[PDB]
Design a protein around this ligand. Structure first.
Ligand SMILES: *[C@@H]1O[C@H](CO)[C@@H](O[C@@H]2O[C@H](CO)[C@@H](O)[C@H](O)[C@H]2NC(C)=O)[C@H](O)[C@H]1NC(C)=O
Ligand SMILES: *[C@H]1O[C@H](CO)[C@@H](O)[C@H](O)[C@H]1NC(C)=O
Ligand SMILES: *[C@H]1O[C@H](CO)[C@@H](O)[C@H](O)[C@H]1NC(C)=O
Ligand SMILES: *[C@H]1O[C@H](CO)[C@@H](O)[C@H](O)[C@H]1NC(C)=O
Lengths: 53, 102, 175, 175, 175
C-alpha cells in the first residue's frame, strides 16, 4: 500500500516507536526487538493509592 | 489558633497494574506499552524500494523465466516473494538454492 | 516504596488534585484549601521522561539476516539456524522482562522519594512552629491564614516572625 | 544499606528475637521486655517472597536443539555450532551473575528501609514525649509501664495523655 | 538523588574541601574552620571501589572461534556466521549500556545516601542543643569553640554538658 513505515514485517508494516515487538521474528528496516511477550507496561507514574483506605 | 497543612500525592480512579522486582502486578497511576503487537496488514511502499515478485520468485526473475521477464534489470531494497508464485519454464533445480537466492 | 511516604505514612492519594502530582491541603481559621507543588511534580515527571527516552524510539536497523521459516526438513543447518534465532529471542525476552521490572521498581521508589522530599522540605521550613501528626500533616501551632499557608507552599515562610506565638501554644500551661 | 539503620545507627542485631525480624526492647520502672513487630516483618518477608517467585520455578521448555559434543574434528560447522552454544552460555552466565548482584543489593537496601520505617513510625507516635538517643532507642520522658509500652508497639499510644508529664521532664529546671 | 541531600537540601559543593568527600564547616565566636569526615568518605570510596572491582579486570579467555570477515560471497553459512556474531555483539552492547546506566544511578543515589547519613548522625548527636536551618546547617544554640566543634566532628560531643545553655537560648523570653 502507499504509506510510510521504516519497519516492515511479513505481517505488514508495524510502527517502530516502542522498543520491542511481538508481531514476527522476521523483520526488515528500523524495527523493535522481537520478544516472546505480548504486553510489557513501563510504569510512568507513582503508585496509585485511592481513598480505598 | 492553629492551622493544618497536609502533604499528599495525586491518584486516579483507574490505575494500571505493572510488574516490578517484588510485585508481579501492582497499581501505578499510568503506564505505557513497550511491546508492539499490531500491524496494519499492508506493506508501505516507502521509504524502502519494495519490488513485489507477484507470480515470480527472485530465482525465476534471475534466470529469465518468460512470465518473469518483466523484472529484467530490476533493483530493490526488499524483494517480496508471494506464497503461490510459480515457475513455468524448463524444469530445473538449483543445488544450494538458498544461497543463490540469498 | 523504599521511602515509606506514598502507600506508607501518607494514607491514600487525592484524585481531586488534578493540577499536579504532589501538593498541599490545609485548614485554618477561615477555611480549607488545596494546591499542587510544581517543583516536586516536575522532578518526578522529568526523571520518568528521561527514563522513557532511553527506552523509547532507539531501534537498531537490520537488513538481510538469516532465514527463519522453512518449507522442508533439512537437518543440521536448519537446526542450527533455528537454535541461533531461538536463543536470540529468549535472551532478548529476558532483557525486556528485567528492564521493565527494574525500571518499575525504580520509578515507584523514585516517586516515593519525591513525596518524602517535599515533606522534609516543608518540615524544615516550619522549624519550631509546627509538629508532625504522622499522616503527612503538620499541625501549625499559630494562626496561619491562606497567605501564610501560601508562603510555606512557595518557600518564603519566615519562621522567626511566628516563633513566639508557635512556641507558646506548643508549650501552653494548665492554667 | 542506603538507609543507614541496619549496620549503621542500629549497632548490631538480636539473635534473641526469634519471633520476628524487627521488634522492640524496653526498660521501664518495673523491668525489661521484648517483642517482635509483625507488620514490618511481613513487609520484608512479603517483598523478598515476591522477588523469590519471579526468579524461582519459571523454566522454559526446550526439546530438540543442536548437538553440543562431538566425536570427530569437522571444521567450519562444528566451530560455528560450538561458538553459538558457548556464546549462549556466557550471556546467560552474565545474566545470572548480574541478577543475584542487583537482587541482593536490593534486598539489603530494602530490609534496611523497613527497619528505618519502623523507627520513623515509632518516632512519629512518640511526639514530644520522647527524645532519640541515636542507637535506635527513644528515651521516653514519662512513666511507661509494659501496657504503655505495648500501646506504642501496637500503635494506639495517645501522646496527649502523657504530654505534660513528658514535656516537664524533658525540660526540668535546676531547682 | 533518592536522598535529596546532594543537589537537594545541600545547595552546592566545596571545591575547597580537598582532604575528603564529606566534612564540616563552622563558625563560632572566635572564627570559622573546616574539616573532612573520614568515615563517610571511606564508605563511599569503599562501595565504589567494590563496584569497580566487580566490573574491572574480569576478562574471559577465548582462543579459536569462528571467522568473522570474509573474502568471497558465499551464502547460507556466511549469513549465519555473520548473524551469530552480530547477534552476539548487540546483546553484549545492551549489556554494557545497561550496566553503566544502573551502576551510575546507583553510585549517585549511594553517595547521596552517605551525605545524608552524616547529616543524621550529626543531627542525632546534637540532641536539643541545635536546630536545623535546612541548607545542611545546624544552628548550635550555645557557645561552641573549635574544640567543641571537633568533639562533634569526632562523635564525642556530650549533649548533657551543654543542655541547659542550649535550651535556654532556643527558648529565650522577650524580656
Ligand atoms: C503475524 O503472522 C504470523 C504468521 O506470519 C502469526 O503467527 C501464527 O499465528 C497463529 C496464532 O497466533 C499460530 O498458531 C502460528 O503458529 C503462528 N506462527 C508463528 C510463527 O508464530 C502471528 O500471530 C501474526 N501476528 C499478528 C499480530 O499479526
Ligand atoms: C511565590 O512563589 C512562585 C515563585 O516563582 C510564584 O510564581 C508564585 O505565583 C508566588 N505565589 C504567588 C501567589 O504569587
Ligand atoms: C493491639 O494490637 C493488635 C492489633 O491487631 C492486637 O492483635 C494485639 O493483640 C493488641 N495487643 C494486645 C495485647 O491485645
Ligand atoms: C578524636 O577522633 C579520632 C578518633 O580516631 C582521632 O583520631 C582524632 O585525631 C580525635 N581528634 C583529635 C583532634 O585528636
Amino acid at each position: 500500500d502507499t504509506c510510510i513505515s521504516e519497519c516492515i514485517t511479513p505481517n505488514g508494516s508495524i510502527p517502530n516507536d516502542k522498543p520491542f515487538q511481538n508481531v514476527n521474528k522476521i523483520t526488515y528496516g528500523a524495527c523493535p526487538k522481537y520478544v516472546k511477550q505480548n504486553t510489557l507496561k513501563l510504569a510512568t507514574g507513582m503508585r496509585n493509592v485511592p481513598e480505598k483506605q | 489558633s492553629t492551622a493544618t497543612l497536609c502533604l499528599g500525592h495525586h491518584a486516579v480512579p483507574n490505575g494500571t497494574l505493572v510488574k516490578t522486582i517484588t510485585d508481579d502486578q501492582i497499581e501505578v497511576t499510568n503506564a505505557t506499552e513497550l511491546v508492539q503487537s499490531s500491524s496494519t496488514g499492508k506493506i508501505c511502499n516507502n521509504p524502502h524500494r519494495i519490488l513485489d515478485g507477484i507470480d515470480c520468485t527472485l530465482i525465476d526473475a534471475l534466470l529469465g523465466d518468460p512470465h518473469c521477464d518483466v523484472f529484467q534489470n530490476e533493483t530493490w531494497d526488499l524483494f517480496v516473494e508471494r506464497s503461490k508464485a510459480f515457475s513455468n519454464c524448463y524444469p530445473y533445480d538449483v543445488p544450494d538454492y538458498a544461497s543463490l537466492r540469498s | 516504596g523504599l521511602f515509606g511516604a506514598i502507600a506508607g505514612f501518607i494514607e491514600n492519594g487525592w484524585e481531586g488534585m488534578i493540577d499536579g502530582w504532589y501538593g498541599f491541603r490545609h485548614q485554618n481559621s477561615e477555611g480549607t484549601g488545596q494546591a499542587a507543588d510544581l517543583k516536586s511534580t516536575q522532578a518526578a515527571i522529568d526523571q520518568i521522561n528521561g527514563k522513557l527516552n532511553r527506552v523509547i524510539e532507539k531501534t537498531n536497523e537490520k537488513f538481510h539476516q538469516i532465514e527463519k521459516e522453512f518449507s522442508e526438513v533439512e537437518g543440521r543447518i536448519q537446526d542450527l539456524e533455528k537454535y541461533v534465532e531461538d536463543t536470540k529471542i529468549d535472551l532478548w525476552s529476558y532483557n525486556a522482562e528485567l528492564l521493565v521490572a527494574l525500571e518499575n521498581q525504580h520509578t515507584i521508589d523514585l516517586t516515593d522519594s519525591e513525596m518524602n522530599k517535599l515533606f522534609e522540605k516543608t518540615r524544615r521550613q516550619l522549624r519550631e512552629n509546627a509538629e508532625e501528626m504522622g499522616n503527612g500533616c503538620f499541625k501549625i501551632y499559630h494562626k496561619c491564614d491562606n497567605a501564610c499557608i501560601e508562603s510555606i507552599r512557595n518557600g518564603t515562610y519566615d519562621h522567626d516572625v511566628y516563633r513566639d506565638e508557635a512556641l507558646n501554644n506548643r508549650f501552653q500551661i494548665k492554667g
